[PDB]
Design a protein around this ligand. Structure first.
Ligand SMILES: [Zn+2]
Length: 92
């Protein structure tokens, strides 16, 4: 309850390295270099602890003036999906 050994930025990245998929509400982490914020689970090839800092939630990370990560916050994964030509107006 009122206790948790060592809450150091160390084990912050331990829970976040483990990819703890269910740590939504537990905190967020914020990679200043892309100006995005995430849940610990960020499955894409990690950006270092050293560019990354930890909040309570994404409204705090919004307080930092960031945007939700395309993988973590909505879950906005676009892999499979066609990389269709590009040019606009295609009625056929
Ligand atoms: Zn992410």
């Amino acid at each position: 309850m009122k206790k948790a050994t060592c809450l150091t930025d160390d084990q912050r990245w331990q829970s976040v390295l483990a990819r703890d998929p269910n740590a939504d509400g537990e905190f967020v982490f914020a990679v200043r270099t892309t100006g995005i914020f995430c849940r610990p689970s960020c499955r894409a090839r990690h950006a270092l602890r050293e560019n990354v800092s930890f909040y309570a939630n994404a409204s705090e990370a919004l307080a930092a003036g960031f945007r939700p990560c395309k993988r973590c916050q909505p879950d906005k994964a676009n892999p499979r999906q066609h990389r269709l030509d590009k040019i606009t107006h295609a009625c056929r």
